[PDB]
Amino acid sequence: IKEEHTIIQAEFYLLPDKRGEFMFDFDGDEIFHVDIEKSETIWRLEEFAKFASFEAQGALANIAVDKANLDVMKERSNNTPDANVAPEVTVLSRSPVNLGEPNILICFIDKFSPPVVNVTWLRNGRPVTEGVSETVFLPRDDHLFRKFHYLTFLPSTDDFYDCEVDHWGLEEPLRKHWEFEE
Template sequence: MGAAGGSGVLLFGVLWVALAGAVTDEPPAHTLAEVLFCQPARPSLGSTFTFDADQLFWFDFPRSRWTPRLPDFPPWPPALETPPQLLRDATFCQSLRRTLTEAVTDITPEAKGIPVADVFPVRPPALGEPNTLVCMVGNIFPPAVEISWQLDGVPVTQGVTHTHYTPTADLAFVRFSYLPVTPAAGDVYTCVITREGDNSSVIAYWVPQNPVPSEVLETALCGAAVVLGILLALLGIAMVLTARRSTHG
């Protein structure tokens, strides 16, 4: 599959393998997918292996090796798809992309997605306690965006890490960026997403809130419950007195 544009062509191939459930009449329970893409922008090549849209491995083309998404994953099975095999596929993809670029440039419209970003902490935030902010960027197409962080308008690079592009079911990509933080009152964290060749950016903000301590919240709730109980008791006494007066009358 591919998308053509005025500046070049993005090509990506998708290999889907459905794993059925115990009963054959049921729809597939899980899906494995391997996606290889090539494009004029950076990165020029990318390949990922996903399970139910969760990335398991990605191929590090500069080092010519499969890399697990998480360090505790088992290594890539050597016999499943060797680096030379994938490099041959990548070379064919680039050759085909150059041929299609020459054929369709300025003829077919360029497909682009507007990235959508969301920033959230890994753990429930607390002022003065270390945490990690996650910037989740979806609807990426083509997979060529830069993600950067700012604190109160000042760029932050210390400890920033990014994930590889992960394909989604709607033929787009998602990417994550992580920033270690120790939030303080008044901080404004910004995740900035820019696309190659564009003058516009997508920005998402996160401002730490000062949550009410749990002890204070429990005390307030207990006090409110006591007051409510007293009011209900007084209301009940008043209704009893009113009923007795009505009976005597």
């Protein structure tokens, strides 16, 4: 046969937020990323950990270089910034929805930069803070980013959900609505 694949090492440092990131991508999915502040390798799926390892220190070293390089670029360009690029937001369920069967809602945030966003899951208009998770900023084919936010839920006709996303490129927060629909 033929095994066509792409592996990507994506890294960045952002100002003025002073935030960095280092991750590995396999065919569009995250393999792992390194928690810069803890110097630890975080696998996207727990099962991956028993098949390999990565010295987190290598990512921190790279981030330090990206940080130094950012200053050179800011100087080289006379601190000339660009426009913020607002994201597209989509909310969908992970699996077919059946009343009373645990499921997961996905809030897909796409095509934006800089890689920073505020996200809030709302259930019946109120913020949900338990049973939620998110990915780091994932690379696209171009210069923009995407991200996934997740919410565990129990399908019911009495509820409705929203994924509220705010980004420096948006005039006002973007609230994407989702409701069960047999």
